[PDB]
Design a protein around this ligand. Sequence first.
Ligand SMILES: N[C@H](Cc1ccc(O)cc1)C(=O)O
Ligand SMILES: N[C@H](Cc1ccc(O)cc1)C(=O)O
Ligand SMILES: N[C@H](Cc1ccc(O)cc1)C(=O)O
Ligand SMILES: N[C@H](Cc1ccc(O)cc1)C(=O)O
Ligand SMILES: N[C@H](Cc1ccc(O)cc1)C(=O)O
Ligand SMILES: N[C@H](Cc1ccc(O)cc1)C(=O)O
Ligand SMILES: [Cl-]
Ligand SMILES: [Cl-]
Ligand SMILES: [Cl-]
Ligand SMILES: [Cl-]
Ligand SMILES: [Cl-]
Ligand SMILES: [Cl-]
Ligand SMILES: [Cl-]
Ligand SMILES: [Cl-]
Ligand SMILES: [Mn+2]
Ligand SMILES: [Mn+2]
Ligand SMILES: [Mn+2]
Ligand SMILES: [Mn+2]
Lengths: 454, 454, 459, 459
Amino acid sequence: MNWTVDIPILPPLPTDLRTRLDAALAKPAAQQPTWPADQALAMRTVLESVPPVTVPSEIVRLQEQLAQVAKGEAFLLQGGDCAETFMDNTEPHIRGNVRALLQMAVVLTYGASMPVVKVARIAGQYAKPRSADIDALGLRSYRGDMINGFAPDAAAREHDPSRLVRAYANASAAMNLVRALTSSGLASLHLVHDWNREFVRTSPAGARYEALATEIDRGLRFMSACGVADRNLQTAEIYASHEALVLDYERAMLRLSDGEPQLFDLSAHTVWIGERTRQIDGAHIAFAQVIANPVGVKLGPNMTPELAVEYVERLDPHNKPGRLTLVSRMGNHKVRDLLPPIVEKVQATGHQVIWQCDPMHGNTHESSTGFKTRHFDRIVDEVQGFFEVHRALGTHPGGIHVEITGENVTECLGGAQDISETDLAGRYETACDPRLNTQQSLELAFLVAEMLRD
Amino acid sequence: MNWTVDIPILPPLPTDLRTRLDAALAKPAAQQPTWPADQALAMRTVLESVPPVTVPSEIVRLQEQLAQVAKGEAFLLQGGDCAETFMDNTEPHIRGNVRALLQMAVVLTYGASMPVVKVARIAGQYAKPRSADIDALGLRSYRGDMINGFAPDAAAREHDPSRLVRAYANASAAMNLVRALTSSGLASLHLVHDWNREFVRTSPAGARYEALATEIDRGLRFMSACGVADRNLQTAEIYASHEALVLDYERAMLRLSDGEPQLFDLSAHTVWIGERTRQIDGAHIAFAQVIANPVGVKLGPNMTPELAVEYVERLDPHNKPGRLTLVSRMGNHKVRDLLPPIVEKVQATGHQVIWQCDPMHGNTHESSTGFKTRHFDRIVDEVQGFFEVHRALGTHPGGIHVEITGENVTECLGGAQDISETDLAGRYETACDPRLNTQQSLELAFLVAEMLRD
Amino acid sequence: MNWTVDIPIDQLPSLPPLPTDLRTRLDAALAKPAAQQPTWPADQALAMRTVLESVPPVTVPSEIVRLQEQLAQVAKGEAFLLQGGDCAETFMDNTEPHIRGNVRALLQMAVVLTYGASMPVVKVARIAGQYAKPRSADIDALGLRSYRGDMINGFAPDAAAREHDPSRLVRAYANASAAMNLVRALTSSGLASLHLVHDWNREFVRTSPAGARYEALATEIDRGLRFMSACGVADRNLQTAEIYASHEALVLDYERAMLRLSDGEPQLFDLSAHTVWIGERTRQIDGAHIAFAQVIANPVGVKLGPNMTPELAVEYVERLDPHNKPGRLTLVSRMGNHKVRDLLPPIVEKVQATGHQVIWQCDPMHGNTHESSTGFKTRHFDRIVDEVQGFFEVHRALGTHPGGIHVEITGENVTECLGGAQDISETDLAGRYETACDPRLNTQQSLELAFLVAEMLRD
Amino acid sequence: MNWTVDIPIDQLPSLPPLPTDLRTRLDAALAKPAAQQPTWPADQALAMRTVLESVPPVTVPSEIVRLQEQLAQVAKGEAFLLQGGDCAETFMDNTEPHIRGNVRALLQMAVVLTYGASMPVVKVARIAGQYAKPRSADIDALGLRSYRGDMINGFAPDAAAREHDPSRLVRAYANASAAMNLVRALTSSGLASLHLVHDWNREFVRTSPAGARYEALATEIDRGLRFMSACGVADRNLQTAEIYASHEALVLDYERAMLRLSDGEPQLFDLSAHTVWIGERTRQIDGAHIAFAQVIANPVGVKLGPNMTPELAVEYVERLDPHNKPGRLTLVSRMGNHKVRDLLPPIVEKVQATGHQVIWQCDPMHGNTHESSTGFKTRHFDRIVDEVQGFFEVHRALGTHPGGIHVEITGENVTECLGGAQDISETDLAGRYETACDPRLNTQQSLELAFLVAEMLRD
Ligand SMILES: N[C@H](Cc1ccc(O)cc1)C(=O)O
Ligand SMILES: N[C@H](Cc1ccc(O)cc1)C(=O)O
Ligand SMILES: N[C@H](Cc1ccc(O)cc1)C(=O)O
Ligand SMILES: N[C@H](Cc1ccc(O)cc1)C(=O)O
Ligand SMILES: N[C@H](Cc1ccc(O)cc1)C(=O)O
Ligand SMILES: N[C@H](Cc1ccc(O)cc1)C(=O)O
Ligand SMILES: [Cl-]
Ligand SMILES: [Cl-]
Ligand SMILES: [Cl-]
Ligand SMILES: [Cl-]
Ligand SMILES: [Cl-]
Ligand SMILES: [Cl-]
Ligand SMILES: [Cl-]
Ligand SMILES: [Cl-]
Ligand SMILES: [Mn+2]
Ligand SMILES: [Mn+2]
Ligand SMILES: [Mn+2]
Ligand SMILES: [Mn+2]
């Protein structure tokens, strides 16, 4: 029942990188798995010899496009599953999520009148933090498939270092498919947009989006009338991202680039540090300072303007637009009060970060029926508030970071489908937080396109 | 006061072309100048040695694009001065007309969702027919600058064969400039469309066109957001056309192409035969049958379905879509009754003509103040009727043929500027029929774009 | 305590099965006898196939359809096929440097071949799945069950490692998908750039002992590239590099589990690769391998060695190109340099007369293998070049198209094939003989071969 | 009764005059003495200038700005300038065939030069206005006032025709605009296609008596083009052909009347052409021609013959490139093949030390003219080639850029220059000596020169 891998039995890092990497990893690290060190080492030794998920030239390219976002010349769409699972790492599922991002992106592009950088939560989003080590059933908490199992039994919840290699296998398989898919017919704007027009026809609030959908279609037809063939467009790039949480995994996937040599985390193109692991003197922030990838930090409602500035100065020490993304997650009822003084203070530093809205993690609650859930209207209202904040300051609302899937799940309440607490039981499939289903994700893109237009 | 040209003192036509050309020109020809034959010959001998205004490969290309029009895959915009004059053959004027066509074309392209073929009435529109040889002042009628002078005195109205060479000089100069202009910054869609947005801001009915103007701007911005640079578009082609009226001029500008050899009239890319010279057994129709250029015939209210068919069978004997354009000029109050049976009968033949609306020549009347004029609303209503006719039959409304200028003249009544009979006296500059000024021409394009959309 | 980590293969729910009609066709084909198959228990094989039936595919049908179009152009004399990579991939060497080196060598070869042929070169790597090999003897020189490639057992000369382990099917898939991922990343990186890739060809000329021989062509290629640039052709404005994946379809357990239905018409594609070939020891006309190739939509190839008859050749054409699709079938000649000029012409004539258009591809390696006095299995560069030379002569005489080459190469500076400008000797072989099977052309030899074939395309 | 038709020049209302400040500057410049001007009455000249002030321009400022950018690239060593066409255009020969033949020859030369130089070639024709020439003697060998070109008087050797006729200004404009129209049509026709144009270079090699000499390069160019095509470069996906117009700015009446203001910054452009040069006999440092060149925005050139000093050269640089704009000024060497290697280096060194970047262009014709024993004025192909050879040597020795050539050519198979592969003799000259002024390279000679210069660019 096991495939078995041989433990390799080789370029030394430049002395300074070895020193800084060691210092970063010696700092305290929250939310790490508790598995034996000798077993972790063996797994990392396997991962240090595998082909990388991404390569440095792609990360450099992403950095260039994120700079444009930071400068107000592009918009960032980041999205995908809350938690990828080994079980659902399948072609239909992956294609569903790629398609939903593409569908959203064309609508946002038209509304923003500028390019949309597409970053999927995919090919590595297998680890999550927990506030409690014992869950509501008295079991050790599920921390994602890189760590332990979702099944509600003790043995499955044991931390298993073999999941580090299993997670890489799943991630590299998914990434291969994402690459194949973005240079397939799935890339074509016309294909992708006719999907949106089917969505408009079947949605209960379709008549509401019909005008913009038609306008987009006429735009695409105009492009074609002017002689623009699909043969000669910017062909689709979808980048890979996840939360950099398990440092055993991230450190094993570091590779030294071939103009000074730098350390790149090649488990992804970009990674972010979450609320529970962003300790300013912690290993995760220190790890982010050593790697060359673009990075994000999640900023919740206890964020101060002063700490935001300290993240900016530590994480973008050389003033490189787009290197750092600050991901606002303040709850729809607070975003308007809490965000402006953070934005003002950071902007005064002269650094150019991307300001990205995560309207999901600040707006979750537990339904009467037991399922943890989010209301579509709160998610939409946070994005609305985020846009108001930036428009008042004249700063750039740079992007959104959403949890979505191309499946017709029943996880977040509301939308045009008016998903109720009752409906939640029928198709609740997430291993963790509730995702916008394909219709809700589409509807949000339309709604956000209008915010971009106004 | 004269430049003087030496009379050349040389490839024989294939025997069949010489025979057919001679037969065509021996047939009766209406509306020809009355100047001595020996003087005409000398002028034609000069014109037989000049560089051509157009070349065969451009005419072949136009034919390819007109085929697409005939098949329902493109739309034809034909427009420019009623009568070009030597006096106004200037850079500002020519640029004005090129700009007005470009402005109209972008709007029509967006509305049609397909390419617009642009054919200017330019670089040769120097001759006109007259129903009376003596005009309202008792003078011999002005027949255009290729024939005689506009000035109201006897001597200026004498027919002067030297105007054949003078007309070529003016035509080749204008064509040179048209070519320079269509590969200048004037070509750029963004430039051209910001003009339309200034028009929207200053028009008295601007609020009416604002929505479509914004929609176009968002379409252009989307194109740019998708990575379409102006560097890599279909760069502007504007073709040259005039009424083939003076056979001394047209025959002198024939050239034998270098896959069988054919006769091309290189005074223009396409030419049309007017109402007063379309005698079925006449020299003009017979001349049109010998040349390889695409051709049009104007069809007025006494047109029968049967005669239309005879034109089609004589002028498109080989069934080449786009070779023939049938130009409906029935008056706004008749187009709806008269056009359908012509369309039905021609369509039954299996030939594919372009159906083009000329909403001007069927709707002219004399104002109380003396000036010959047309009402904007009748012009618009004829185009509207033309579209209704085709939509009922499921045939392709292929194009419009309008008389326009990029100057702010006061020649046609109405439009958003509400030009009245009083206003007509202030800026009436046409050597012949009243042209839509730059604002009216633009407004019509918007109106026609909506017909194309509905 | 023995330097291994086990990776749980959790059972996960199955996606919908393939259509009953197509599975009916498949079962009939696979009831045919299959040579050279692993001996592992059926129940274990089934469990592992079940895992593979639900994994993300290595390739997708639209790429296969695109390859088929490019291979049609090859069959019609309008493109040239370059196929190459390791004789056997190993899991141990399935690393970034090794993959990058093989991708690089193939690109280096292709630009030289493109110039020489004055037509596009279709690039198909032996990569992301070449993990199984037949054997003639069930017992090797060490008295062990033979190594059958990493999909089946281990190279290490010990009993435990040599047992047939069906878990290696899944390990094979993990390695194929990781490699394919990287091949995709590399072909859209700076590695794709013609200028970058041809500068490497320039360093090669400067340092090769016989570089003076190739300088003329290398300079001429550089001048061609600079002309492109001078006419205003930007490198982003070219056909961006496609490298397809291929291997020998040997382990039917693996291939059948990697079958998928196209989205739609709908039919079976083997998504473990873009194209696969059938080997000399598994091409029985009524065997399971040919039957499997009949059922799949991918372009396929069949190796043709010196025992081939024109009649059997014709039977392959009738079974595997029944719809007369140009380029769907490639016939790969491996007759030895001393036999190709005699044995190939009758095969070609007979196939051409069928009215089908196959690709005629030259494998100049597998017919020219010998053993050194110092032990190592080896091939002579000159014999390899000479078979391709003879292959061109055959087609030139017949007015037929020499479609392409199929070679075993690596971007490593190994010492596996004798000869080349480096004059690799029998003594030298012991330095870096790293192949887990047949001797490969090293990076210099492979690049030197491309220059030589470029000259053969120019005459 | 004498085979002429008069074309009325109707007076038409004037458009707005040029700005007063700019006309003030112009008047100050044109008060300077002007050599070689027609003697026609001032009042008639004025009337004709008034007509020309309102005609559509020959060129537009955006094309001139684009040329200036391409000429900057030449000045910096990143492109090569090809300038060529008739020594004198005549109204009688300003026909479609003749224009097409000259455009064709220039394109044929440019593709060969592009390959050889491994960089873009800027194509500037001597066309659409080269209708005026200076003379040394006011009385010719027939006892007549000298022919001054068709803008001024008639070639025919009779008194009436030789009188200076200001109507010829308008006839010149009519002919320039007709020619420019056609040049524009031709450069966006199939004549633009690299393949078409290079096939002509292939026929030329096959039939030239010394074609064996050029076959290698011709084949190599063809292989480069086929490589482009093989890498997927479609001919519609290239920089579509631009051919600019130039002539010697000689008749100040014509040039000043063709001045226009750019739309906007705003400044004077001479829209009778894209670029104009000042000749050897009108380049007085304080004369009207240099002053006129100062005032206009177009790129300009100055001919530099064997009397030139480094100091005067430097004065041209200071007057005509006062803002240090690379490529705004071209210095055109015409020192004779026996003198260029001695006379050019001191001029170059001195100009380079100024810190300005001019274009160094070689005119290998006007310094190598002699008369045959059979009467005809002529030039030797070998002397022409040799000046360009010597010009390259000068720049190679100095590390400076040989910017381009300026040659007199036609697409006609005339017999005007001795030598070339056809070995044109003194006897042969009488067959087709058709130039109204200096002897031109015929189509074969001009194409042969391009191969030879291509080799000089390759070394
Ligand atoms: N070198 C691979 C290591 C590997 C590749 C891919 C993978 O998913 C896991 C492990 C092996 O020995 O198997
Ligand atoms: N594998 C990393 C550091 C490393 C070492 C060497 C190298 O080339 C890349 C990355 C660790 O956790 O120490
Ligand atoms: N060959 C021209 C003929 C010509 C050209 C242009 C023109 O506008 C009129 C006449 C000449 O002799 O003048
Ligand atoms: N110039 C024309 C006919 C013609 C003759 C010869 C030629 O090459 C073209 C056209 C005429 O009126 O007779
Ligand atoms: N869903 C995957 C199946 C898989 C994916 C990738 C892989 O390399 C092996 C197996 C799992 O259960 O782990
Ligand atoms: N408006 C023109 C001026 C002109 C145009 C073209 C030309 O070749 C000469 C003169 C005319 O009066 O005729
Ligand atoms: Cl890289
Ligand atoms: Cl599906
Ligand atoms: Cl042509
Ligand atoms: Cl103006
Ligand atoms: Cl079975
Ligand atoms: Cl053995
Ligand atoms: Cl004056
Ligand atoms: Cl003389
Ligand atoms: Mn989440
Ligand atoms: Mn009219
Ligand atoms: Mn092998
Ligand atoms: Mn000369």
